[PDB]
Each structure stands twice: as structure tokens, then as C-alpha cells.
PDB file of C-alpha atoms and ligand atoms in Angstrom:
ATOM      1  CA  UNK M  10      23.794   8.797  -2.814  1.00  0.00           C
ATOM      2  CA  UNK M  11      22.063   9.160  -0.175  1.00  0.00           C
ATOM      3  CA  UNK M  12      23.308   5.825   1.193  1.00  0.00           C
ATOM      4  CA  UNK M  13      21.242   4.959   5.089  1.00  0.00           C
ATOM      5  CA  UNK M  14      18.766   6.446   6.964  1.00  0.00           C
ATOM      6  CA  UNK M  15      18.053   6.091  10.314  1.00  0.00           C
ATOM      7  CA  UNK M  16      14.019   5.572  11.148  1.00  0.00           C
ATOM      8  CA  UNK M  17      12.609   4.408  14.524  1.00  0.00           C
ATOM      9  CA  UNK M  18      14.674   1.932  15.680  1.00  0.00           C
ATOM     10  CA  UNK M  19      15.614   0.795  12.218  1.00  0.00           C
ATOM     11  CA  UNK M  20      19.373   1.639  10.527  1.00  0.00           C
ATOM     12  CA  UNK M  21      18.009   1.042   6.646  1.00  0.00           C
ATOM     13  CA  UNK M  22      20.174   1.223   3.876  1.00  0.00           C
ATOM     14  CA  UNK M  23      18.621   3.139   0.696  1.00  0.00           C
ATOM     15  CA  UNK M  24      18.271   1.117  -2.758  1.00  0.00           C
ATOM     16  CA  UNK M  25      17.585   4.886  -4.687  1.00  0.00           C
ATOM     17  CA  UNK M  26      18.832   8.347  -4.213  1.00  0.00           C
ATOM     18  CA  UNK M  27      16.096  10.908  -3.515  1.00  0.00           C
ATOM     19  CA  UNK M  28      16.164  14.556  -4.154  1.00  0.00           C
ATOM     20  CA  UNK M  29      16.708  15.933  -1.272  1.00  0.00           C
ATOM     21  CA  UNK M  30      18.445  19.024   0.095  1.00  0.00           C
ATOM     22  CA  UNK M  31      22.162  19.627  -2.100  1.00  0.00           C
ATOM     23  CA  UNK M  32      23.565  19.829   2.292  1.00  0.00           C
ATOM     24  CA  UNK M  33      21.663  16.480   3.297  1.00  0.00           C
ATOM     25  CA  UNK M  34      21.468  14.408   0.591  1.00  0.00           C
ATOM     26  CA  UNK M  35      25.289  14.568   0.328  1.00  0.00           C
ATOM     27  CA  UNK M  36      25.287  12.996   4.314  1.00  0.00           C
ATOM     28  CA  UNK M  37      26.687   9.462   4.485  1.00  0.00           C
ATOM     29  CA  UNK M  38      24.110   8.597   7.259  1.00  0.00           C
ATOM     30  CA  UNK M  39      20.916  10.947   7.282  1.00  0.00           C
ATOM     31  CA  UNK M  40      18.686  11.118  10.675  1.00  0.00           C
ATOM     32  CA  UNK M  41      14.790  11.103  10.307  1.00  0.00           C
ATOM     33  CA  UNK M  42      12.025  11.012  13.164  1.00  0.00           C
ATOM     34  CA  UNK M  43      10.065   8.906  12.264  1.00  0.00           C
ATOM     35  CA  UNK M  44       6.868  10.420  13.223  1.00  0.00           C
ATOM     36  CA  UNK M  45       7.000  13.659  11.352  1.00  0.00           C
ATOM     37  CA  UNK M  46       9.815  12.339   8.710  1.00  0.00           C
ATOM     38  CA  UNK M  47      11.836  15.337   9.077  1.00  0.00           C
ATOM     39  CA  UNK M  48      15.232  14.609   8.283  1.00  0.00           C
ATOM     40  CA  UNK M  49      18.308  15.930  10.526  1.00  0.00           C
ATOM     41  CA  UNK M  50      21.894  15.778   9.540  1.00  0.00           C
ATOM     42  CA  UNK M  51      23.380  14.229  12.697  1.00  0.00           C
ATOM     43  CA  UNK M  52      22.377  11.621  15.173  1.00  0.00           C
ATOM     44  CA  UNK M  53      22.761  14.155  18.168  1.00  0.00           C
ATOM     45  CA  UNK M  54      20.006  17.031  16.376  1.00  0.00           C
ATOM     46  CA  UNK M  55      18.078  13.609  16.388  1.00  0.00           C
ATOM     47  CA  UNK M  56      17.715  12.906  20.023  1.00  0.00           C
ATOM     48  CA  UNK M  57      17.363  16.959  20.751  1.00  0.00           C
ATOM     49  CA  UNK M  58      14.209  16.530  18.539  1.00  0.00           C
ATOM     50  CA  UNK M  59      12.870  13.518  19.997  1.00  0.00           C
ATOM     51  CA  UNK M  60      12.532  15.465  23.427  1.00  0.00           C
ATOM     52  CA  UNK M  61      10.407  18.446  21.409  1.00  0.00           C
ATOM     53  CA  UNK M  62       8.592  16.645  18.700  1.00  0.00           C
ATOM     54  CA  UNK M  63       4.724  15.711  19.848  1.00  0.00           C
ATOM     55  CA  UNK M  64       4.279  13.550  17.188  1.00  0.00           C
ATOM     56  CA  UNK M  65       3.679  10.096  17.644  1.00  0.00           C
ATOM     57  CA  UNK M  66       1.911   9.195  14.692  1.00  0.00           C
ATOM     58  CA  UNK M  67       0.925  10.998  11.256  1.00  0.00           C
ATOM     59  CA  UNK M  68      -0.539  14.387  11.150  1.00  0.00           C
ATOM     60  CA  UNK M  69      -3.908  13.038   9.656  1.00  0.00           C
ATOM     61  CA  UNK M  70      -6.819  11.272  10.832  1.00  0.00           C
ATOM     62  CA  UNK M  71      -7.519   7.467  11.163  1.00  0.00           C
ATOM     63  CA  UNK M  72      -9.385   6.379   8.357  1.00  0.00           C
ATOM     64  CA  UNK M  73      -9.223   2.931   9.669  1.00  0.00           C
ATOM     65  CA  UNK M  74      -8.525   1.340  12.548  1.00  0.00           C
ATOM     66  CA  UNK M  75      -8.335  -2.349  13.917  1.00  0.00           C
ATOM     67  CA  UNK M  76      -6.219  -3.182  16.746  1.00  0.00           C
ATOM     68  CA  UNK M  77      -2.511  -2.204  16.117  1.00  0.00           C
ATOM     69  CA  UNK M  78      -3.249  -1.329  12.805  1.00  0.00           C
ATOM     70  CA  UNK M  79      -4.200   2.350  11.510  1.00  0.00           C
ATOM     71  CA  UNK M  80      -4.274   3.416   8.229  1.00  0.00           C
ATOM     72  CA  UNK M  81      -4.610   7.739   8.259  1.00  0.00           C
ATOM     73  CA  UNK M  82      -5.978   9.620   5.391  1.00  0.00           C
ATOM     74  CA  UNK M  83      -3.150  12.224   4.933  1.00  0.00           C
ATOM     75  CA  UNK M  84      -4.220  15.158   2.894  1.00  0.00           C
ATOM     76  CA  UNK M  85      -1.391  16.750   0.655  1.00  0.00           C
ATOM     77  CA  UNK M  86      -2.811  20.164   0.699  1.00  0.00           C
ATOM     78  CA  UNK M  87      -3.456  19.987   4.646  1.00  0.00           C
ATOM     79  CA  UNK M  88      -0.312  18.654   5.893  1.00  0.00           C
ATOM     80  CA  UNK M  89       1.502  19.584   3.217  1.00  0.00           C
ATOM     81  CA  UNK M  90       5.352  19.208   5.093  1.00  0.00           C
ATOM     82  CA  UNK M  91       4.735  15.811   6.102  1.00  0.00           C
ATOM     83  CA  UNK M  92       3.580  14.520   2.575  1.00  0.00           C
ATOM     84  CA  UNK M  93       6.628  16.408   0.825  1.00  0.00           C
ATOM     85  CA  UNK M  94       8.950  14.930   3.414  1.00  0.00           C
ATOM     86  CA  UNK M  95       6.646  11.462   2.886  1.00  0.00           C
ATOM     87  CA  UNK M  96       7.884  11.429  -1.194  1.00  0.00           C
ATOM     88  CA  UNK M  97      11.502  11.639  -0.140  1.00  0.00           C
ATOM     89  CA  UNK M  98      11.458   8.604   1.945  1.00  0.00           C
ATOM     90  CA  UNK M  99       9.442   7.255  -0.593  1.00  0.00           C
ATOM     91  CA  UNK M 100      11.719   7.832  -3.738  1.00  0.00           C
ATOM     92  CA  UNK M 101      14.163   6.168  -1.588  1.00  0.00           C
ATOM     93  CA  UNK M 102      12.626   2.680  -2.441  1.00  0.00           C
ATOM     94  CA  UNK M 103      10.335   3.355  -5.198  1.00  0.00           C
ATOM     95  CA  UNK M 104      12.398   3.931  -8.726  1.00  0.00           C
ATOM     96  CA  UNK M 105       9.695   5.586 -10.351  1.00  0.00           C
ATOM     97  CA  UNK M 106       8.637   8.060  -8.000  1.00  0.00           C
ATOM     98  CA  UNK M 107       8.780  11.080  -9.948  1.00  0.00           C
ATOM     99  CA  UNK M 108       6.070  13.057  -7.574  1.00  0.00           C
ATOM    100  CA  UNK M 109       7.865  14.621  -4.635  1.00  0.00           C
ATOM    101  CA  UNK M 110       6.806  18.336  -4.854  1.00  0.00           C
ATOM    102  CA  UNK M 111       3.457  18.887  -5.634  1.00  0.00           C
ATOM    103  CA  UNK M 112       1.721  16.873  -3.140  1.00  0.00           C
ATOM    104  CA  UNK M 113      -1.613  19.017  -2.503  1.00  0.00           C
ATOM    105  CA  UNK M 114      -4.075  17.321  -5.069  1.00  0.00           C
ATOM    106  CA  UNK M 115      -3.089  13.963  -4.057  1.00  0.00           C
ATOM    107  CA  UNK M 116      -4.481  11.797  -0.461  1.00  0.00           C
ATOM    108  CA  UNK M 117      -2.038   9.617   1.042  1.00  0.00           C
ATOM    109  CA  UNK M 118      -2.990   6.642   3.044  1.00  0.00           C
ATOM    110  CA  UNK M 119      -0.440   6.112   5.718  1.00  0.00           C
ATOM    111  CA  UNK M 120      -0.580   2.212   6.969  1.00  0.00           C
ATOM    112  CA  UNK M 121       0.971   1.903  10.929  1.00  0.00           C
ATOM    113  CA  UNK M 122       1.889  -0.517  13.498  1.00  0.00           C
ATOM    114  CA  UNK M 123       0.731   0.665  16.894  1.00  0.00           C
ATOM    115  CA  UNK M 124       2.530   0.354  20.413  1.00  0.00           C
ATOM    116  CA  UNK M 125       3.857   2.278  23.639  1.00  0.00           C
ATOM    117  CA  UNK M 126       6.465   4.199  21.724  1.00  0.00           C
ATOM    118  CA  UNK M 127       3.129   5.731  18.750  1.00  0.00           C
ATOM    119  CA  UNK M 128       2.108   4.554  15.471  1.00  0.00           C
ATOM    120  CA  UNK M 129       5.205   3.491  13.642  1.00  0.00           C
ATOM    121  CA  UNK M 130       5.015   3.977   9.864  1.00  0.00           C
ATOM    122  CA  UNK M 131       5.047   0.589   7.671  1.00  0.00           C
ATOM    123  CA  UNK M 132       4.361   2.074   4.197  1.00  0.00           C
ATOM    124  CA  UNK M 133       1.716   4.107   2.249  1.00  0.00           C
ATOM    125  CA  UNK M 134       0.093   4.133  -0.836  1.00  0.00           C
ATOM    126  CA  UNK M 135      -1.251   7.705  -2.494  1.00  0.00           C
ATOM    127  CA  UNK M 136      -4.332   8.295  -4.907  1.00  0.00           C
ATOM    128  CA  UNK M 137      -5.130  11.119  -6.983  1.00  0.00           C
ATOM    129  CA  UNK M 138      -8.497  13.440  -5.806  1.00  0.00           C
ATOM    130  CA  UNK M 139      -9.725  13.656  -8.889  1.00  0.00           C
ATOM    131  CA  UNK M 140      -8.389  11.033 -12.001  1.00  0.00           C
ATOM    132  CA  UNK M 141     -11.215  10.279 -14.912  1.00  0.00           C
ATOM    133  CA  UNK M 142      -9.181   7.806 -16.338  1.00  0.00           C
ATOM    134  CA  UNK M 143      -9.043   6.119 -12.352  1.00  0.00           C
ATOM    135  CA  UNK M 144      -5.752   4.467 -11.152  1.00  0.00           C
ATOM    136  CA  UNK M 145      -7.101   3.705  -7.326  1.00  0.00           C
ATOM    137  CA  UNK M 146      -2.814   3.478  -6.670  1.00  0.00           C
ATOM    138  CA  UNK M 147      -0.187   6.255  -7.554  1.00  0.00           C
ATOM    139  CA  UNK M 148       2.685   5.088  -5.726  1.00  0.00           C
ATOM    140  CA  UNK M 149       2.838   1.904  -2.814  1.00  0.00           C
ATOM    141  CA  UNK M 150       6.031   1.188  -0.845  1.00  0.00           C
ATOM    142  CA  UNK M 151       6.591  -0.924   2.409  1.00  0.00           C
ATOM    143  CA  UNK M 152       9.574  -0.209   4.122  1.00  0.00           C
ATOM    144  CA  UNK M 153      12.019  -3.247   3.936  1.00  0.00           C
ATOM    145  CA  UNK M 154      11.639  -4.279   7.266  1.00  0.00           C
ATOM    146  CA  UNK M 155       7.952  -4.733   6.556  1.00  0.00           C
ATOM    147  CA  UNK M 156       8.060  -6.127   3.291  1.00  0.00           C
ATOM    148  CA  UNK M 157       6.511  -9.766   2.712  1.00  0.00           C
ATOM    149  CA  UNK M 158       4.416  -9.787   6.303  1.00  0.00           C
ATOM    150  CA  UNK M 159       1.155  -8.877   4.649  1.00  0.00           C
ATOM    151  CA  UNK M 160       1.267  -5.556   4.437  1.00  0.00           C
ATOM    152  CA  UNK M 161       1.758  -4.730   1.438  1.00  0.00           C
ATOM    153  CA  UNK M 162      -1.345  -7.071   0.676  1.00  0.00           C
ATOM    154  CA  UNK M 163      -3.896  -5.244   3.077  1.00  0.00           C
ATOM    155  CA  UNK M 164      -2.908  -1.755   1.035  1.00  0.00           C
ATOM    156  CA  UNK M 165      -3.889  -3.254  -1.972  1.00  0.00           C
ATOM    157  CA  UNK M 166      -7.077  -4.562  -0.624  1.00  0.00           C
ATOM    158  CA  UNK M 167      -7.671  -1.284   1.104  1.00  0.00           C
ATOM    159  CA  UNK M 168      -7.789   0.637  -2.243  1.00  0.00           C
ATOM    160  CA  UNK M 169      -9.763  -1.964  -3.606  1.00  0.00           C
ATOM    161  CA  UNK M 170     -12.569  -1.557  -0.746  1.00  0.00           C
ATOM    162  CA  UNK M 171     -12.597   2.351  -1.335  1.00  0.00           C
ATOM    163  CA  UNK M 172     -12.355   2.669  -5.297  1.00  0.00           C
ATOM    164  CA  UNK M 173     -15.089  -0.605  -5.594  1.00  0.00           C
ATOM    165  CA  UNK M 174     -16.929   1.297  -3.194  1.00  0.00           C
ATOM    166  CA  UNK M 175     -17.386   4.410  -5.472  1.00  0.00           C
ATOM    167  CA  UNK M 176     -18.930   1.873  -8.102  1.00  0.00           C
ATOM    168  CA  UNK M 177     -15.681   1.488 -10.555  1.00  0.00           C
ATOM    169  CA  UNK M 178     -12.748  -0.830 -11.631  1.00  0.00           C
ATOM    170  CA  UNK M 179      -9.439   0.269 -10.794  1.00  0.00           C
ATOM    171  CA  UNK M 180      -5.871  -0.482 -11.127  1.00  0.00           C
ATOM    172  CA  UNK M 181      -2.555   0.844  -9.992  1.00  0.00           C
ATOM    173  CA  UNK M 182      -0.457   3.525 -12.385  1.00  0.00           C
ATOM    174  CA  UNK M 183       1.709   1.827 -13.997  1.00  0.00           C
ATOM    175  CA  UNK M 184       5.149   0.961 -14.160  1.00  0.00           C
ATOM    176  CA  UNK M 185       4.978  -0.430 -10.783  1.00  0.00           C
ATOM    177  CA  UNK M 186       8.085  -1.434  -8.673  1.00  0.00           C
ATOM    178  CA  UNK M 187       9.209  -5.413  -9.022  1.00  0.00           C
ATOM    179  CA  UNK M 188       7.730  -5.994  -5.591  1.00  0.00           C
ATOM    180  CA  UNK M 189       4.438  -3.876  -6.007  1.00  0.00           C
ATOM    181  CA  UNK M 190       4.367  -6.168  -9.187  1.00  0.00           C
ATOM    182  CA  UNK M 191       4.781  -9.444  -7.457  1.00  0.00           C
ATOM    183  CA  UNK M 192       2.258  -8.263  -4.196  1.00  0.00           C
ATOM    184  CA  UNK M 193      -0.645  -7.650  -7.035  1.00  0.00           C
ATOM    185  CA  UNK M 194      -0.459 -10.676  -8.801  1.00  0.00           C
ATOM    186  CA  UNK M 195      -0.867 -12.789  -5.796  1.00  0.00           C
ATOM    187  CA  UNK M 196      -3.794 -10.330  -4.107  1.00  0.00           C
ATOM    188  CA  UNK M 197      -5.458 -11.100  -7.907  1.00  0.00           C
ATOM    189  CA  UNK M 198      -4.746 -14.915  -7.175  1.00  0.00           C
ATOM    190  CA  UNK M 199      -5.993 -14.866  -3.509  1.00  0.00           C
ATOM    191  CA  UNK M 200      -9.600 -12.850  -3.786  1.00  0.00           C
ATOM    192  CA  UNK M 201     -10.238 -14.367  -7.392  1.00  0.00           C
ATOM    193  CA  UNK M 202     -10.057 -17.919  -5.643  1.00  0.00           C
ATOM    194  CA  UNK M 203     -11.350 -16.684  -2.246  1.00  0.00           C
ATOM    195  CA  UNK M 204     -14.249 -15.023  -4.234  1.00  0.00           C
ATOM    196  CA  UNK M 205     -15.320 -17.993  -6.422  1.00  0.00           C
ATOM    197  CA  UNK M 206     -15.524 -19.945  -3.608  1.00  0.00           C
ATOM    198  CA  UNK M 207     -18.016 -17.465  -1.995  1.00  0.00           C
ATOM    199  CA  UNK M 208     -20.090 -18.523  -5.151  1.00  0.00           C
ATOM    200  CA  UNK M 209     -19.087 -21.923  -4.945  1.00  0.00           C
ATOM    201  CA  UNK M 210     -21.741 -23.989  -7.643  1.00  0.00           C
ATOM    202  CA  UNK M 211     -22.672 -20.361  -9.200  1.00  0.00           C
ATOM    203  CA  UNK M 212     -21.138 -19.582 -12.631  1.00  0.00           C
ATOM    204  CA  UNK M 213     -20.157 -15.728 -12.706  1.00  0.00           C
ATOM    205  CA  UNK M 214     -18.795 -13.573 -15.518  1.00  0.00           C
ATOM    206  CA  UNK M 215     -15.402 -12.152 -15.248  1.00  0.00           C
ATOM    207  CA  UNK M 216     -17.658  -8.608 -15.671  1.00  0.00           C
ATOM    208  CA  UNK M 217     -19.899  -9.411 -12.431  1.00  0.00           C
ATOM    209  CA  UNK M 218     -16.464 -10.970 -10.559  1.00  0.00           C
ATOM    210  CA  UNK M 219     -14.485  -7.315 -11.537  1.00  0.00           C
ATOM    211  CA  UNK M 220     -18.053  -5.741 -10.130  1.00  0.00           C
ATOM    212  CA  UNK M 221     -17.458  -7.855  -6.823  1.00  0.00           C
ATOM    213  CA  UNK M 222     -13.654  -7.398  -6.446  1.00  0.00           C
ATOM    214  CA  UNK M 223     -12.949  -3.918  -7.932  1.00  0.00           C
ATOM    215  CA  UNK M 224     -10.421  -5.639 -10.238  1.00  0.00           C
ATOM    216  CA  UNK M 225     -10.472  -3.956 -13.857  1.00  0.00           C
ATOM    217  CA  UNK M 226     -11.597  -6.929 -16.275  1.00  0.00           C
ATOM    218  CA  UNK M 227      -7.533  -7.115 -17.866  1.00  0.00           C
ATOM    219  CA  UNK M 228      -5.933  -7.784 -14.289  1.00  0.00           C
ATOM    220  CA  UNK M 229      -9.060 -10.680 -13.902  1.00  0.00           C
ATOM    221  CA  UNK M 230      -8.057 -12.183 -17.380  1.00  0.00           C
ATOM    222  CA  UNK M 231      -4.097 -12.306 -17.398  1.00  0.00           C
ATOM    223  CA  UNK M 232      -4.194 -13.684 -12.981  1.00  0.00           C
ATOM    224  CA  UNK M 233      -7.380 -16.131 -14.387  1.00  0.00           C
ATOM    225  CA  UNK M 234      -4.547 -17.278 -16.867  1.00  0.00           C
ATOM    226  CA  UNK M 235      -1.913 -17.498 -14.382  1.00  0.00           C
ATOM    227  CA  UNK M 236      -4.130 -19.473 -12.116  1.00  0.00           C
ATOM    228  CA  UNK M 237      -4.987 -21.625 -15.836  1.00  0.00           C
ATOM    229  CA  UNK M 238      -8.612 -20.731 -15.441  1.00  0.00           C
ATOM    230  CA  UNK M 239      -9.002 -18.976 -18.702  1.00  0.00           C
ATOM    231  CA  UNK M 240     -10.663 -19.359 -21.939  1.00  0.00           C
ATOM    232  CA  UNK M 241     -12.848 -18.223 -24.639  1.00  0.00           C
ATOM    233  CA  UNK M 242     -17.006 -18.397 -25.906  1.00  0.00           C
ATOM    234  CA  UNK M 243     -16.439 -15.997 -29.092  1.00  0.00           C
ATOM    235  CA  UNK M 244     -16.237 -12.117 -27.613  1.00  0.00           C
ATOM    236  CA  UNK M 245     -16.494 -13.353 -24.341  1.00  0.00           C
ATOM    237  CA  UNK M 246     -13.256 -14.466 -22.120  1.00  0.00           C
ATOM    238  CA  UNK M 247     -14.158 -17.009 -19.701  1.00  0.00           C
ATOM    239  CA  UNK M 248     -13.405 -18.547 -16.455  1.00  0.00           C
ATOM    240  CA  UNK M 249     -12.527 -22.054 -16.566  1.00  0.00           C
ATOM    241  CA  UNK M 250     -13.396 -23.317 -12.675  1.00  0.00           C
ATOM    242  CA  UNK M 251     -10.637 -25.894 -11.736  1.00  0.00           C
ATOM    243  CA  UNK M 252     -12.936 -26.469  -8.669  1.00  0.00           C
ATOM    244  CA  UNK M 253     -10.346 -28.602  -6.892  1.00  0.00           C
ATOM    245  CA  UNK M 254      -7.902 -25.077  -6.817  1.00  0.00           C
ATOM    246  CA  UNK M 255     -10.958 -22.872  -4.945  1.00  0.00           C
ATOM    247  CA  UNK M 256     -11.461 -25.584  -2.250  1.00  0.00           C
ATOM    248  CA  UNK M 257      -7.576 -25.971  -1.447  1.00  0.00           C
ATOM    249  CA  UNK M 258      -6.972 -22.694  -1.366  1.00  0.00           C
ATOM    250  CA  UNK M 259      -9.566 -22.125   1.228  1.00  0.00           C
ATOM    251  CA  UNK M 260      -8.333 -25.119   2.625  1.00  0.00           C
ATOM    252  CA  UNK M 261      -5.002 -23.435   3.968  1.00  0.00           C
ATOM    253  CA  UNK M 262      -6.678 -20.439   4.209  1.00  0.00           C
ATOM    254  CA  UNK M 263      -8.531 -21.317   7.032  1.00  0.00           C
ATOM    255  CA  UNK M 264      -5.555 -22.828   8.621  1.00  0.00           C
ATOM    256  CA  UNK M 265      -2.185 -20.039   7.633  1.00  0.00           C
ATOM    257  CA  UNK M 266      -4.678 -17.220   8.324  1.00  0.00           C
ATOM    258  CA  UNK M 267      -4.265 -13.611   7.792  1.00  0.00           C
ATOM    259  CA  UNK M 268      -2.038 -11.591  10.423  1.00  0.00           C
ATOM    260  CA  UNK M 269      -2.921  -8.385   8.492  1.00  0.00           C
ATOM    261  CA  UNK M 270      -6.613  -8.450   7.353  1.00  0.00           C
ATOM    262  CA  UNK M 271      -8.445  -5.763   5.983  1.00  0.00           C
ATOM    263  CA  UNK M 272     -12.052  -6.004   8.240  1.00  0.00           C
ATOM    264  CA  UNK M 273     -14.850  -3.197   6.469  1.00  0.00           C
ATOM    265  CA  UNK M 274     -16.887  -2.877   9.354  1.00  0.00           C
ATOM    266  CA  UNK M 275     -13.437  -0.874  11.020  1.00  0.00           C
ATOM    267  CA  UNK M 276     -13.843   1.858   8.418  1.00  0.00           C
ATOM    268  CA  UNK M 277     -14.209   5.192   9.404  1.00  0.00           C
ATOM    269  CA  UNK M 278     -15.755   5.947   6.437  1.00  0.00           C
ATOM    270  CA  UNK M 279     -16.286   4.593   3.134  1.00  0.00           C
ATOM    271  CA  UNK M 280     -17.534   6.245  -0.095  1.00  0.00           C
ATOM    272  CA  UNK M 281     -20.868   5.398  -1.948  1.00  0.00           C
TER     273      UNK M 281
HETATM  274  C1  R7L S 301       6.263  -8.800  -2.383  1.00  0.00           C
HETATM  275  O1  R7L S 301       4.947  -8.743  -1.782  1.00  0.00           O
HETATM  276  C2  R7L S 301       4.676  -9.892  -1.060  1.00  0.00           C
HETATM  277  C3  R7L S 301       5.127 -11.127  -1.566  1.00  0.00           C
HETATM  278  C4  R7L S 301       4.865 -12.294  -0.850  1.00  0.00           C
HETATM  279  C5  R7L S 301       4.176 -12.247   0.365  1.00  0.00           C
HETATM  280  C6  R7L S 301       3.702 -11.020   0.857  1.00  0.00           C
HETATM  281  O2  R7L S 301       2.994 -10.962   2.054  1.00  0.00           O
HETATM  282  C7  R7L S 301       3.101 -12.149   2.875  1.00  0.00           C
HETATM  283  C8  R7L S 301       3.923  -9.825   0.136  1.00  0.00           C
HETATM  284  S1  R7L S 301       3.217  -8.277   0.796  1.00  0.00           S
HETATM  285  O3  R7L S 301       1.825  -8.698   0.832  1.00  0.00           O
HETATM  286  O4  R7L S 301       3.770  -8.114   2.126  1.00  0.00           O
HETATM  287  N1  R7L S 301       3.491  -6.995  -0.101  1.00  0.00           N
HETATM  288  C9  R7L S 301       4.749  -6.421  -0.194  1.00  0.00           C
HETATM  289  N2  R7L S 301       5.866  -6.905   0.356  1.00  0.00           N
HETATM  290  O5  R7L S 301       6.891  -6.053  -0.057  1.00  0.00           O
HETATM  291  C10 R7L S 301       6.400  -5.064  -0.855  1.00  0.00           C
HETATM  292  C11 R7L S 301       7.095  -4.004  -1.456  1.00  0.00           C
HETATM  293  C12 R7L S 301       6.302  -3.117  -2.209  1.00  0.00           C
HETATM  294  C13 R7L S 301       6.819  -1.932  -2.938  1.00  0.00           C
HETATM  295  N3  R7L S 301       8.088  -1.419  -2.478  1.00  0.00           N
HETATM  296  C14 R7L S 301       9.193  -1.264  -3.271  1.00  0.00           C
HETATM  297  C15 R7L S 301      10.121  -0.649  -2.465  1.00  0.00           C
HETATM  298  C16 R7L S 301       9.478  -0.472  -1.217  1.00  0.00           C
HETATM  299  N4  R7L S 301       8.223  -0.943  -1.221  1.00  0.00           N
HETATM  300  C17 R7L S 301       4.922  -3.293  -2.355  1.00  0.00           C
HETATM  301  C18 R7L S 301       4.277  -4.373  -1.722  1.00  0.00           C
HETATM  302  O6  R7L S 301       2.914  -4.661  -1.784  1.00  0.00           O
HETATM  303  C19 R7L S 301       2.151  -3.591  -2.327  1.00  0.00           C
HETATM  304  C20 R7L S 301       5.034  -5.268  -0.959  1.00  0.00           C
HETATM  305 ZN1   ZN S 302       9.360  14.885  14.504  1.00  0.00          ZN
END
């Protein structure tokens, strides 16, 4: 309880119940524009909203942008609403979501698909502004109509380009959600292959590779094991380069493509 929401053009039913108002959380069905996520308690206030409501996209600015993709920095302590309203659609889907309130010293990168009717929200992923002990990931949810079209895979790469960028590791703050778990592990996969093909014949350390991908050195070690590339030359894990793996991969790499590919050079900005 809640039980369905209605966003966009979607009907969605909710897998978590979200703090939300004692009045609208109660709701069977609650209404949500799915522009400025404010939630309505009946599918008529909707529509009389829809004819006011200038919104047709995120109150934030584009970050990134490549074709119909946008990803908008979204400043808690700026548009403040938005982000609170943002965490209850979140908590929705994410089981250990326990930040809804106090949004202002957190960023919130807001990942769209772009048409005719605006920039319709796929899912987001939010990052402290200032954590010494650095988890480049918070939270990171992909509405289920979204999930497993590479989405969730081009967030994960996008906090790698901006946390590598600013010269350290990172990782996301854990517990993660099942799904967040299972989109990681194959990212790790993907760019540790991709990336030792891009050395192809050169023999790197798993220190220089987490230099290269942003990956802390742990995430490297337990996917390089996974992918049974590991081993050991006394205080020093190794990778083990099953040669024949890097050259398929990139093999049906070239040939499945990406439909959702982060490209750097349609950054807005990037840190240094
Ligand atoms: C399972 O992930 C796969 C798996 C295979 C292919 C594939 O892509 C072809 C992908 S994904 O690349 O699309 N990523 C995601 N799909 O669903 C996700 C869901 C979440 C979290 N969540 C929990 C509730 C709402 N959201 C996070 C995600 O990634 C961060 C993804
Ligand atoms: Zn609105």
C-alpha cells in the first residue's frame, strides 16, 4: 500500500510502499505527471493539470545529451519539490531507499527518452556532493518498463565517466537492489573485457585497469573471478588473460551493438 501509479502513458503497479501523504498513499490508484512527479489523487485532477503544467522535462539542466537521450543534473537544494517528489517514486521500486526528505546535499542525475510529447523519465541515479569515503551511486532505479534495454547500463557507465574523471575509484552504496546487483556485475564483465582488448598484447595491473575504468580494485577482482581470469603472484592479485574471451566478446560486440551508449564527447561538462 500504495498499490499503481499512473505515469505518462504507463499504468505501473508498485513492488514497495512509499511514504507518502497519510490521504494519498491510502489511494488504490494514485495519479502522477510525469514531468514534475507531482502526485494527484484522481485521474480527472490529472488531465486539469496536464492543460497548466509547462513542464515537459525535469526542472534541471542537461548534463548530457545525445540524440533522444538526456541525462539532467538535478540539484536537491535547487529544485528541491521535484527531488522530494523524485524519492517517492523512487522508494516505490527501490527497498532500501531510506532518503526521501532531505534531498538538498545530494545531485540527482535524471536519465530521459526524448519525443513530441517532452523528455519522458526512464530512471535516475543520485550522488552525494561531498562523500570522503566516495560511493559515485546512492540510489539507481529504472522504471519497469525500462528495465533490461540498456539503461540501466549507460547510468552506471555515466557515474563511472564523472567519478574516474575526478581521479578516484568508486563504487555504489551498498546494499543495492537485486537488479542494480545483476546490471553491475555485467557492466564489470563488459568494460573489463572491452578494456583488455583496447590493450590487446599489453599486460596491465588490476591497479592501472581500476585507474582506466574507475572500478575500485575489489569489484575488478571478484567480476575478474567471475569471468575466471583471476589469480595470485604473492601480494599481488592477478589477471589471468583467457585471450580467446576478449576477442569473442568484441566479436558480438561489434555485431549486437549498443542502443544506449554513453559517447564523452556529448558531455556538457565533465570534472578534472
Ligand atoms: C538488470 O539489468 C540488466 C540486465 C540485463 C540486461 C540489461 O540491459 C540490456 C540490464 S540494464 O542494463 O538495462 N540495467 C537495469 N535493468 O533493470 C534495472 C533495474 C535497476 C534497479 N531497479 C530496481 C527497481 C527499479 N530499478 C537497476 C538497473 O541498472 C542499474 C537495471
Ligand atoms: Zn506537472
Amino acid at each position: 500500500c500504495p498499490s499503481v501509479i499512473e505515469f505518462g502513458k504507463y499504468e505501473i503497479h508498485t513492488w514497495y510502499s512509499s511514504p507518502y501523504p497519510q490521504e494519498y498513499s491510502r489511494l488504490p490508484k494514485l495519479y502522477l505527471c510525469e514531468f514534475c512527479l507531482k502526485y494527484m489523487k484522481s485521474r480527472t485532477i490529472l488531465q486539469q493539470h496536464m492543460k497548466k503544467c509547462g513542464w515537459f522535462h525535469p526542472p534541471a539542466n542537461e548534463i548530457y545529451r545525445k540524440n533522444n537521450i538526456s541525462v539532467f543534473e538535478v540539484d536537491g537544494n535547487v529544485s528541491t519539490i521535484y527531488c522530494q517528489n523524485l524519492c517517492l517514486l523512487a522508494k516505490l521500486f527501490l527497498d532500501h531507499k531510506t532518503l526521501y526528505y532531505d534531498v538538498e546535499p545530494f545531485l540527482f542525475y535524471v536519465l530521459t527518452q526524448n519525443d513530441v510529447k517532452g523528455c519522458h523519465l526512464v530512471g535516475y541515479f543520485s550522488k552525494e556532493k561531498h562523500c570522503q569515503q566516495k560511493y559515485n551511486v546512492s540510489c539507481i532505479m529504472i522504471l519497469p518498463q525500462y528495465q533490461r534495454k540498456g539503461y540501466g547500463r549507460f547510468l552506471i557507465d555515466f557515474s563511472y565517466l564523472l567519478s574516474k574523471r575526478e581521479g578516484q575509484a568508486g563504487s555504489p552504496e551498498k546494499p543495492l537492489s537485486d537488479l542494480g546487483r545483476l546490471s553491475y556485475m555485467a557492466y564489470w564483465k563488459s568494460v573489463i573485457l572491452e578494456c583488455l582488448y583496447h590493450q590487446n598484447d599489453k599486460q596491465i595491473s588490476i591497479k592501472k585497469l581500476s585507474k582506466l575504468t574507475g572500478i575500485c580494485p575489489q569489484d575488478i577482482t571478484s567480476t575478474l573471478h567471475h569471468l575466471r581470469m583471476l589469480d595470485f603472484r604473492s601480494d599481488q592479485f592477478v589477471i589471468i588473460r583467457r585471450e580467446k574471451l576478449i576477442q569473442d566478446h568484441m566479436a558480438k560486440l561489434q555485431l549486437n551493438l549498443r542502443p544506449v551508449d554513453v559517447d564523452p564527447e556529448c558531455l556538457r561538462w565533465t570534472p578534472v
